[PDB]
Amino acid sequence: AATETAILEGWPTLQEVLEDSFMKRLLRCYLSDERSEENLDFLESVGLYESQFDKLTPKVRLEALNFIKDQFLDRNSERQVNLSYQIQQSILKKLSEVTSNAPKDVFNEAKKATEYLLYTEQYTYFINKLNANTIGTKDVYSLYLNQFPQPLYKPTLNKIIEIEKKSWNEDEVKRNTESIKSLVESLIQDECNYVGVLTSLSEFSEIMTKKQILGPDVLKELFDHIPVLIQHHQKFISSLQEAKADEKVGEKLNSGLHFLVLYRYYLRHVPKNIAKLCSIGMTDEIEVGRELYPLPVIEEFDKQQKMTKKMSVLQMLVYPYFRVRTYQAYVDDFIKITKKDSQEVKELEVVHSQLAIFQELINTYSDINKIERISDALKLLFPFSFTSIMPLFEGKNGICGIASLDRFDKTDINQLSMSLNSRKKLTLIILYRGVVVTDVPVIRNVSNSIDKSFYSFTLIGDIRDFGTEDSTETIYIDVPEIKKRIWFGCESTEEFKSCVEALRTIL
DSSP states (O other), X not given: OTTTOOSXXXXXXXXXXXXXXXXXXXXXXXXHHTTOOHHHHHHHHHHHHHHHHTTSOHHHHHHHHHHHIIIIISTTOTTOOOOOHHHHHHHHHHHHTOOSSOOTTTTHHHHHHHHHHIIIIIIHHHHHHHTSTTTTOOOHHXXXXXXXXXXSSOHHHHHHHHHHHHHHTTOSOOOOOSSHHHHHHHHHHHHHHHHHHHHHHHHHHHHHHHTTOSOHHHHHHHHTXXXXXXXXXXXXXXHHTSTTGGGSHHHHHHHHTGGGGGGHHHHTTTTHHHHHHHHHHTSOGGGTTTTTOXXXXXXXXXXXXXXXXXXXXXXXXXXXXXXXXXXXXXXXXXXXXXXXXXXXXHHHHHHHHHHHHHHHHHHHHSOHHHHHHHHHHHHHTTTBOHHHHGGGGSSSOOEEEEEEEXXXXXXXXXXXXXXXXXXEEEEEEEETTEEEEEOSOOOOOOOOOXXXXXXXXXXXXXXXXXXXXGGGTEEEEEEGGGTEEEEEEESOHHXXXXXXXHHHHHO
């Protein structure tokens, strides 16, 4: 009860805090700031005693018992747990009778008494502090951030990608800044759309269970805490659509968004998330039968989402990682149309700090560049079907180089020359996990399709070597498995060099 009751609805139980490394570190900063670590320290010692027990001799178990006693439970001890008389007397009486053969559960009674104190006197105040009106403006978040002390791509590719990003932002819900009322309407519609994405993932999770495609463990690795976040976002939406909520914007964002820290429970799985779903998609059907073949199940959902929400399933998995940016963009807009120097604008500045803080917390336990590179790779390859892209995202991935092609050919491996009249308008995309050629307009008009395949595709592991005829800006790769040399003729010297350097680093 002390470990499995949530004192705040939708917020983790003590056990759920203790079992996550990020959340436990926050609790520990909080406890350390108050200089009251004894309860947690006692619980970890007991935990360590129990996990060490089986492989130790009785002699060494007794040593460990006496040490733990001397630290936390003895009447003169330095880190004494604040046990009341009637509890302390029961515990020490029993301990004083264990002189001989220390059992594995000698600390059960004391453990239960200490969990009770941790839950009631400490964990309770910790969860309350994460929900205080003043969190994120020398609190537990900044104490935590004080324990921690650069472009996504090399120059030529960075320019190309940055160009495409200007177009990717022409979606979707424009923020209507006519008035504050109008801007809240925008945010409500945005949240509703976003919850629609989260709800679709939830339903996809349901589909995989009913089909027995995945067990409960793998589904946790994919969708952990997604239902809990949906609930908080729904509570936020209900708050925003309250009558004259346009009069209380600052307060609603502050209190409505404290739960953002809880994104940790989902985000700790990103981007392993994506890699796993790809692994699942790549299982040969012969190993599971036509019946439990996951691929057509993923494909049907992916196709469905791309037609409906213009997002693939892999994009939806990485999407929540960037949610805070949307809130920061809204807050900057609310501030701009709010009366200068007013109380209402000071409330919004507070929210501005909070959101910057949430983003910082996320950065301490994830690799932003790795995740952003994956996210960019998914937007660029949106026209391609899940089946076509999955080997590319089965591990860490990113775009390493892009060149539009003037010529292309496939000869036998080791052939010194390509054929004449091999002129084709194509695009070469070098990715970390593979080399792609496509006839699909993928950079700048761009395709409105969602079902495309790759004209040429080579897993990076299947490339023995590569060469270049620099004279004509030509790149070739030798691919033994299929006994082919594949030739890429580039239009830009610039993109040619970009692509050569890319292959040099990757291969």
